[PDB]
Structure formats: C-alpha cells, structure tokens
XYZ file of C-alpha atoms in Angstrom:
73
model
C 78.303 42.905 73.175
C 80.661 44.633 75.610
C 83.227 46.442 73.462
C 85.593 49.413 73.690
C 85.186 52.531 71.551
C 87.872 54.997 72.638
C 91.287 56.244 71.520
C 92.794 56.945 74.942
C 93.269 53.323 76.002
C 96.010 51.251 77.635
C 97.331 47.695 77.355
C 99.519 45.556 79.615
C 101.315 42.221 79.257
C 100.831 39.633 82.003
C 104.322 39.079 83.403
C 103.131 36.616 86.044
C 100.057 34.505 86.908
C 97.303 35.702 89.241
C 93.888 34.195 89.970
C 91.035 36.516 90.939
C 90.307 35.868 94.615
C 86.770 37.059 93.889
C 84.481 38.363 91.144
C 85.715 41.822 92.134
C 89.235 40.830 91.086
C 90.545 39.862 87.650
C 92.412 36.683 86.709
C 95.498 36.712 84.490
C 98.015 34.153 83.229
C 101.699 34.773 82.517
C 102.196 35.485 78.825
C 98.659 36.748 78.272
C 97.680 40.360 77.599
C 95.337 42.416 79.778
C 93.580 45.563 78.568
C 93.980 48.372 81.101
C 90.649 50.157 81.529
C 90.999 51.964 84.856
C 93.504 52.505 87.667
C 92.684 52.119 91.359
C 93.579 54.937 93.751
C 93.686 53.817 97.384
C 94.875 50.453 96.070
C 98.534 51.336 95.526
C 99.992 48.800 93.116
C 96.652 47.774 91.633
C 94.943 48.607 88.339
C 91.592 47.816 86.722
C 91.698 45.915 83.443
C 89.916 43.316 81.324
C 90.885 39.866 80.048
C 88.995 37.089 78.262
C 85.882 39.222 78.625
C 86.407 39.567 82.368
C 86.740 43.036 83.893
C 88.261 43.416 87.346
C 91.254 44.519 89.404
C 94.774 43.084 89.536
C 98.201 43.829 91.071
C 100.295 46.078 88.831
C 103.289 44.176 90.205
C 102.101 41.184 88.176
C 101.764 43.059 84.883
C 103.880 45.099 82.469
C 102.479 48.302 80.965
C 103.008 48.362 77.200
C 104.829 51.258 75.481
C 103.129 54.304 73.908
C 103.932 52.891 70.470
C 102.359 49.463 70.969
C 98.665 49.857 70.144
C 96.441 46.852 69.439
C 93.358 48.841 68.431
C-alpha cells in the first residue's frame, strides 16, 4: 500500500499530455493531476512525480506547479 505521509509535499496539474518513454519515465494526460515527489537535478526541466500509482520522471514544461494555498492532503 504505497502511500504518502508527509506535510512538505507538492502537487502539479498536467497542462499537456506526455507518455512515459520507459518505466523510468512517468505518463501524464492533459487535465490530470500529478503529485510532485522529487525534482531532478542534471535533468533541467524535469521533475519526479507520481500519477495513477505510477512514480517516475516527466518534463516540467508539460506540467503546472500548483500554488502554496492549493493542498489536496
């Protein structure tokens, strides 16, 4: 039962579609919401998040970081 138990979290709204080229990547569909878990370093413009129970990496250029007020959990 993979779940999150932390206060310092982050959420992002899928602005555009993006299929994970591999298991290492994460798939996202426009309109959906991805939970930001980590943030790549050498991968400028890429962040690590989770969606539909799938954790991976995706282009930050295809997602919109939610405000500090918007908090699902």
